[PDB]
Amino acid sequence: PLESQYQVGPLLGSGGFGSVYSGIRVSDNLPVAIKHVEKDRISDWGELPNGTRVPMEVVLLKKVSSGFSGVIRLLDWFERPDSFVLILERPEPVQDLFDFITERGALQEELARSFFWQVLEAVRHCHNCGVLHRDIKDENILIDLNRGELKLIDFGSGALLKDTVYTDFDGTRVYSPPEWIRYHRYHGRSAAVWSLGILLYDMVCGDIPFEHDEEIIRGQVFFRQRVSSECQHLIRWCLALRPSDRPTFEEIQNHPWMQDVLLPQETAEIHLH
């Protein structure tokens, strides 16, 4: 059962994603997150190998939860009469990248370089497992403050990775590529790289670059903060209006601005602790 397995604490959040409660596995005080969601509010269904009709979020999660990674992992789940309850990891102390930036203002480039890299590595992981997150942002990235490690969260907008076109999008708008805005059509990888450019700008500037459809499609990036020239270049390269002019993951990771990254543990010693 559940309540017998987990001792539910206070509500951590609630929204489209449902309601998230702080919790702890009784077996070993492991800190966990307990996410509840009503079936009636589930749009994207799918099924496990054994063919169980579960939320696509569960399918994906299970696919990226094997072994170590920068993705909060799904420990266990439960089906209820009118809802699904997922048991997910819970760093402690932890803080999402949104509040972190909101608190600290634009980040130092060395810190951003560390964070972004970890992000990239986690997205390459997801794609290896054939999963497309579809909603990468500072709100869906948690920071394990004592480790300096970032974890991806919220796969309820995700999709199985595919080489053909996507015509559905239910992720964050201002983070949506121009090709979706204009044509309602996009491809996995390249649309991902567009959101990774929004994120990078977001870190180094403290706020996303575009706000209106007009801005997203014009593709003009103005820097509100003092950013290195190498960094503005990588950012403008990810925000290339034409999907095929955007860099590949390997290209992003091989960008000058991305050399000499600090490992997590030092990132924490230097910028968090």
Ligand SMILES: N[C@H]1CCCN(c2cncc(-c3[nH]nc4ccc(-c5c(F)cccc5F)cc34)n2)C1
């Ligand atoms: N739109 C996003 C924004 C954040 C909440 N959302 C989701 C969606 N799917 C999984 C998890 C989630 N899985 N494990 C967790 C441990 C802590 C906290 C956590 C936290 F550290 C700080 C504030 C709020 C929190 F919810 C969340 C966790 N969270 C929706």
